[PDB]
């Protein structure tokens, strides 16, 4: 998986044109993520390739099989100048010369990346949810006065384009999430928007499983341990599979809360539907405290254990 970075002495203009093509809905094909990575690199490392290659982001991406193939040009002022002559890029090129040049402005790259970041909290849910959420966030930050997005970015078509770009692109998601988490707390509005989005993205797609896990746990000053009902013979397989899925998730470390969004490996079975009995136990224990588990419906077959879990928690 070869990622092409574009290297010129007109990086800002090239980048803004990559944003032009992306926003136009033009399919960049196998250059998409390469283009995206260039943007990120121009933004966070000011196109210093040596500073990037030694970064945790490049570290991780290389550790995940990505190979960086830099295309040095310069004198190239135009994204069109930079695409290989190779004929499987013919339609791309054909579309790109129909591109209007919005003269490169300052902060438009950060503008773009923050916009993208607003789609993250509900990305795994779907386009409707991700986009609705994005719009509500847009109005939030707008009325904060911290940032104003162009209104034509708010049409449903354009936001479907962006949603798509995030879906297809692993690198974009990873860079935005990594920087959301690790980038400090300076004086760049876009970094704080991205940070806020990533903060709202934590455990996206994994909150039900998380809370079920929370509620089959038992606080004892002898450490902390599993619920006794969890340790019956009927629930010997659910606990096995759950422990295994949880280990797989745990592999991903600090990226574990974002593992569903980034589509990380090992998450197949981290889906509460597969664990009815543990869900029953957790909902019981939850009820006994008043609060409840959102998104968890116990079918008849496990209603008994549900009360079995319920009453016993109230007698404690």
């Amino acid at each position: 998986k070869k990622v092409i970075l574009f290297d010129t002495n007109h990086q800002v203009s090239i980048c803004n044109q990559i944003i032009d093509a992306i926003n136009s809905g033009i399919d960049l094909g196998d250059l998409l993520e390469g283009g995206l990575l260039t943007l990120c690199v121009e933004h966070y490392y000011n196109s210093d390739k040596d500073k990037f290659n030694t970064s945790p982001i490049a570290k991780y991406l290389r550790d995940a099989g990505y190979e960086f193939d830099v295309i040095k040009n310069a004198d190239a002022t135009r994204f069109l100048d930079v695409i290989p002559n190779e004929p499987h890029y013919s339609p791309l090129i054909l579309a790109l010369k129909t591109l209007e040049s919005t003269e490169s402005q300052r902060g438009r790259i950060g503008l773009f990346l923050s916009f993208c970041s607003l789609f993250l909290p509900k990305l795994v849910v779907g386009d409707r949810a991700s986009i609705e959420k994005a719009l509500r966030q847009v109005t939030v930050h707008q009325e904060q006065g911290i940032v104003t997005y162009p209104n034509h970015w708010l049409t449903t078509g354009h936001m479907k384009v962006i949603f798509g770009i995030l879906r297809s692109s692993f690198i974009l998601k990873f860079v935005l999430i990594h920087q959301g988490v690790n980038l400090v707390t300076g004086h760049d509005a876009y970094d704080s928007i991205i940070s806020n989005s990533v903060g709202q993205t934590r455990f996206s797609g994994l909150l039900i499983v998380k809370t079920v896990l929370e509620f089959i746990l038992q606080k004892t000053d002898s450490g902390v341990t599993l619920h006794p009902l969890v340790r019956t013979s009927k629930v010997k397989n659910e606990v096995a599979s759950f422990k295994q899925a949880l280990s797989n998730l745990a592999r991903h470390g600090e990226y574990a809360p974002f593992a569903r969004v980034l589509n990380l490996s090992g998450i197949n079975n981290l889906e509460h539907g597969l664990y009815p009995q543990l869900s029953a136990i957790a909902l019981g224990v939850a009820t006994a405290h008043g609060s409840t588990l959102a998104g968890v419906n116990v079918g008849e077959q496990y209603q008994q254990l549900r009360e079995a879990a319920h009453d016993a928690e109230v007698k404690l």
């Binding site: 896990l213 949880l246 280990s247 470390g253």
Partner: peptide, 23 residues
């Protein structure tokens, strides 16, 4: 709550799963 920290730490790998599950 507070245990929420336990579930999350189990999930991020900050808490060994063997502490809570064992063997």
């Amino acid at each position: 709550s507070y245990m929420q920290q336990v579930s999350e730490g189990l999930m991020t790998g900050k808490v060994p799963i063997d502490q809570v599950f064992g063997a």
